[PDB]
Each structure stands twice: as structure tokens, then as C-alpha cells.
Design a binder for this molecule. Structure first.
Ligand code: KHC
Length: 340
């Protein structure tokens, strides 16, 4: 009544069941880890879930068990569900397949941006999404947890039904934070390489140790991307990425240069970088001081850029915390509806 293919995926398709409770009604994508299927939960109101079905492969089974354990601790600290994390509704071991059920939500903030032709979110939408992202991660950070992999693809709209205006505009900017697979408690082993390239802070690139400030850097990057529709750091190499940071944000703190094992990036305390090369000319022409990317010069825009610069502080010990970010004057622009 159950089988696996040669990769250890669960053989299944639309119409199948699990646990005499989940009825598979759609495909939501695959990965190295296994499958995600849209299911009706017949033990709820035939309510829609995303069900992640992990391969019958040791290393994926164990990675899923650690993710479940994280999701269980978040749940215990947020019973009331106030801090805007994607809801884990159930989990089970199905013949060696770890299965995790989540509340089905709408498009991720990246898919929505792509489908609007990368035309940026209006500032009031950036502000509401920023506020929820700060609120969600502040709660995790105060419970000794770092996400480590915040990116637009991991931030979901609760409903992504949009109005078309003379541009697509999402009707409701309520979001949830997903993908706790890499989340790390203060007392746990911190792996060396965290965050996706574009969202990765200097203290991770220089391997100087990381903690909650890692997520604040990622959020600064994400807010830039919501505001302009393109990524702040478009590079796949550490030495170029640090040069881009310097051109956009100012000089790297000399104590971070002194402490890094990666001395090869530096000569007499300066980044090794040939301004005259092809790559040199490209970075010169495309990576300007952060303020030069504002679209308007009214207060609301100035306030976003001031908050964003404090989220992109090189030194993680000087970087704004999310408890501080939530008091920033940028958030006075929220409606009384958004602010709760
Ligand atoms: C909860 N959820 C959702 C998606 C997932 C894709 C993969 C995984 Cl592992 C999960 Cl949990 C997903 C998709 C994205 N991003 C969609 C699937 C339904 N249509 C909109 C995107 N929404 C989710 O709630």
C-alpha cells in the first residue's frame, strides 16, 4: 500500500492519502530533501496544508527531525501564534518519511515581485512588511534563536490576491516567516557558512563569528530589494562582495580586517581590488553610496534609508537590534490597523 522510488521519494500522486487524514490535491514542488504536496486535512475543515514529505535517506530524515525540534520550541514559546512564523500543524514518521504539515499560505514575496515584472513594492507595503519581519525576528532573537537564512523566497503573503492599477498591488501585506531548517540556538554549534550569498553579512564572509545580528543584515538587504525590486549585492565571490559593501556603505572596521584569517583579501589593511579591470569598471559603474538609491527625497524615504543603513552596519556589535528597529521613526507611518 506504500512504496519508494530509487531516490527514496515516496511514490505518490493527486488522489493518494496519508495517516487516513491527508488527501493529496496538488504538487507544490520537489527538492533534494523530498516533495511538497498541497493536501486537504480531513481532521480539520478539509483545510489546505503544505505537506513536506522527506526522502527515505538518513541525512534528510535527520535534517527534518532537527527542523521539527526547532519548530516545536518556537510553538511552545508562541502558543497564541502572535509572532508571524509559518504554522506547523502536524508532523509524523510515515514508513521512514518524515512528514511536516504547514498552513497553506500565498506567494512568497519574491514570486510576487517576479510576477509584477520586478516593479518594486510601494513604500507603505515595504514599511508594513518591514514591521512584521522585525516583530517576528525580534521574538525569535529574544528566545536565543537566529534564523540565519532570511531571504524574500522565505517570506510568505497570507493572501497574495492583488489589485491591478495604472502594476500589481497586493491587497493584504500580512506576511509570515518560513524555512527554519538552518535556525540555530545560542548554545548550539554555529556552522561557518550561513545565509544565502546576497543576504550574507561581513562577519560571516570574514568568519569572525555570527549571532542574531546576521538576521538584521539579511533584513536590511531584503528591504532594499522590496524597495528597488533588485538585489543590493549581485556577486558570487567574497573579495568582490566586501568591495561592493565598501563602495555602498563606507570603510570596513579595521578590527574586523585585523581579526580575519582571510588576510589574502587585504594589502596594508586595504581590499585587494584592480579598479581598472573589467570587474573593477563594472563595480565602479553599478555600486554607488546607499543614499543614491532612494527613489524620492520626502521624510518617509529618508527614514527607510536611515533604518536600512543601521541594519547594514559592518560591525555586528554596532548593528541595530530588532527591538531598537521597532522603535525607529519609520514605523510611525504605519496605520493603526498595521501597527497591531
Ligand atoms: C507553506 N508553503 C507554501 C509554499 C511552500 C513551498 C515549500 C514548502 Cl516546504 C512549504 Cl512549507 C510551502 C509555497 C511558497 N512559497 C506556496 C504554495 C501555495 N501557493 C502559494 C505559494 N505557499 C505556501 O504556503
Amino acid at each position: 500500500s506504500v512504496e519508494d522510488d530509487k531516490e527514496g521519494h515516496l511514490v505518490c500522486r493527486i488522489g493518494d492519502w496519508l495517516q487516513e487524514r491527508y488527501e493529496i490535491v496538488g504538487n507544490l514542488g520537489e527538492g533534494t530533501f523530498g516533495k511538497v504536496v498541497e493536501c486537504l486535512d480531513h481532521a480539520r475543515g478539509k483545510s489546505q496544508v503544505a505537506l513536506k514529505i522527506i526522502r527515505n535517506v538518513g541525512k534528510y530524515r535527520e535534517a527534518a527531525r532537527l527542523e521539527i525540534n526547532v519548530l516545536k520550541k518556537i510553538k511552545e514559546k508562541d502558543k497564541e501564534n502572535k509572532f508571524l512564523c509559518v504554522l506547523m500543524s502536524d508532523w509524523f514518521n510515515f514508513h521512514g518519511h518524515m512528514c511536516i504539515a504547514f498552513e497553506l499560505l500565498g506567494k512568497n514575496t519574491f514570486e510576487f515581485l517576479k510576477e509584477n515584472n520586478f516593479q518594486p513594492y510601494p513604500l507603505p507595503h515595504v514599511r508594513h512588511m518591514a514591521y512584521q519581519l522585525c516583530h517576528a525576528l525580534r521574538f525569535l532573537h529574544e528566545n536565543q534563536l537566529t534564523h540565519t537564512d532570511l531571504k524574500p523566497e522565505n517570506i510568505l503573503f497570507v493572501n497574495s490576491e492583488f489589485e491591478t492599477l495604472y502594476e500589481k498591488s497586493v491587497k493584504n501585506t500580512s506576511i509570515r516567516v518560513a524555512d527554519f531548517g538552518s535556525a540555530t540556538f545560542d548554545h548550539e554549534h554555529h556552522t561557518t557558512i550561513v545565509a544565502t550569498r546576497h543576504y550574507r553579512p561581513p562577519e560571516v564572509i570574514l568568519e569572525l563569528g555570527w549571532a542574531q545580528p546576521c538576521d538584521v543584515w539579511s533584513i536590511g538587504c531584503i528591504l532594499f530589494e522590496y524597495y528597488r525590486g533588485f538585489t543590493l549585492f549581485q556577486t558570487h565571490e567574497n573579495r568582490e562582495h566586501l568591495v561592493m559593501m565598501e563602495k555602498i556603505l563606507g570603510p570596513i572596521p579595521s578590527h574586523m580586517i585585523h581579526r580575519t584569517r582571510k588576510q589574502k583579501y587585504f594589502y596594508k589593511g586595504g581590499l585587494v581590488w584592480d579598479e581598472n579591470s573589467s570587474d573593477g569598471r563594472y563595480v565602479k559603474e553599478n555600486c554607488k553610496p546607499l543614499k543614491s538609491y532612494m527613489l524620492q527625497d520626502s521624510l518617509e524615504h529618508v527614514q527607510l534609508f536611515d533604518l536600512m543603513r543601521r541594519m547594514l552596519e559592518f560591525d555586528p556589535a554596532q548593528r541595530i537590534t530588532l527591538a531598537e528597529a521597532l522603535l525607529h521613526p519609520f514605523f510611525a507611518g504605519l496605520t493603526p490597523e498595521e501597527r497591531s
